Design an enzyme around this catalytic site. Structure first.
Site, PDB file in Angstrom:
ATOM      1  N   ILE A 136      -3.158   2.705   9.475  1.00  0.00           N
ATOM      2  CA  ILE A 136      -2.830   2.494   7.910  1.00  0.00           C
ATOM      3  C   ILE A 136      -2.594   3.779   7.339  1.00  0.00           C
ATOM      4  CG2 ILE A 136      -3.252   1.534   5.665  1.00  0.00           C
ATOM      5  CD1 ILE A 136      -5.395  -0.356   7.158  1.00  0.00           C
ATOM      6  N   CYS A 137      -1.315   3.925   6.428  1.00  0.00           N
ATOM      7  CA  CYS A 137      -0.927   5.014   5.653  1.00  0.00           C
ATOM      8  C   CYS A 137      -0.684   6.459   6.390  1.00  0.00           C
ATOM      9  CB  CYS A 137      -2.096   5.355   4.312  1.00  0.00           C
ATOM     10  SG  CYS A 137      -1.386   6.226   3.081  1.00  0.00           S
TER      11      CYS A 137
END
Lengths: 219, 219
Positions: A136-137
């Site tokens: 994620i991210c």
């Protein structure tokens, strides 16, 4: 999904020097709501720095990655060196600058970065067995350093960051905050979260989809 | 609920010496999903202690409540002394031992506890105007110290803790993790969260109901 065990790798407690707290909690929420069990880990080592989140400046102290990550998991965490791939059905890595400072040194080295050896070994073990990975991210920045083959992934739409990942061997795919990218052959799921989110509900929409997809790939 | 401003009071970053991180993030999520805006605050003062979340033992260091709470809000927080009741439509206080160590000294004083003066003044200002209050986990322990009149509230089912709150003037009402108690005349909503939750999805079920109710009371 009762019975499913989802590994979760944390890097501290807070966006600037550890794990993005919203992202970590949203991940835990989605895992639990699906009836699966989160199994959390964090490497036992000092953080690269300690940041005043109010000002953004460095502080003159030192904090341990594992000790601080325990805050997010209410104490229910283990050193990453103890992770047993045979006991896990998947692996998820939330973002925050900790993913780029502590799980790797992407923040200062870019395309010449190195990734924590225990992160590399666990991720490789999942891929060997056909167990899905969710990053994620900024965490997907570690992927083309871990795997020496092309991978479809995303960090959102930021052109400079996408250029760096490509230099490292990735195929970068644009994605909005409320969607995901999936490398089907390698069972790797990515989503931008705070790279693009303007509030927590927008980050949750992408994370929820990521977790759902990871669980489907783990069956 | 676009346009609604919900104050949120934090006490640190982590269950043992500050705000319960799950509870805080679940609160922010529910507020955002409803289209309202969270306005976060934390008092600018040192924490009562700093706890190793891995072991539960005290650490030999000092941390500032505001500085650490900024981790949860990604920097978007203000000192509680700057809170303007006229700009808020409601007030929500998540739990964690910080609510009992930093927002008050309930943890060591019980029924003879005192509450942070700025917490008392803000809560009283809401009640004067008919703006709802939502208190989660152990935070409701502060209510009968703030208001000198009987209030219906809950901390779950724990008989010893309920006895203490009654000694302080409350009417304690049993409640399960997935429900709420509402004092209709005073517009006060409480829910047990981690006093009873065995996982994050059970805490979210009660918190979601609390936030929903607070928003309805604020209209």
């Amino acid at each position: 999904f009762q019975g499913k065990k989802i590994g979760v790798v944390l890097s501290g407690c807070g966006v600037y020097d550890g794990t993005e707290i919203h992202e970590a909690v949203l991940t835990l929420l989605a895992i639990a709501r699906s009836g699966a069990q989160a199994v959390c880990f964090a490497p036992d080592k000092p953080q690269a720095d300690v940041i005043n989140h109010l000002t953004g400046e460095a502080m003159a102290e030192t904090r341990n990655v594992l000790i601080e990550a325990a805050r997010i998991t209410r104490g229910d965490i283990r050193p990453l060196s103890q992770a047993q791939p045979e006991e896990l059905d998947a692996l998820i890595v939330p973002g925050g600058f900790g993913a780029a400072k502590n799980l790797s040194n992407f923040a200062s080295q870019g395309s010449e970065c190195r990734v924590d050896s225990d992160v590399v070994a666990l991720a490789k073990a999942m891929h060997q067995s056909g167990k899905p990975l969710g990053f994620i991210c900024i965490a997907p920045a570690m992927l083309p350093k871990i795997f020496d083959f092309p991978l479809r992934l995303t960090i959102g739409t930021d052109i400079d960051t996408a250029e760096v990942l490509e230099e490292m061997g990735a195929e970068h795919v644009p994605c909005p905050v409320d969607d995901i990218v999936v490398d089907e052959d390698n069972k790797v799921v990515t989503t931008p979260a705070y790279m693009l989110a303007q509030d927590i509900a927008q980050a949750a929409s992408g994370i929820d989809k990521l977790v759902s997809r990871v669980l489907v790939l783990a069956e």
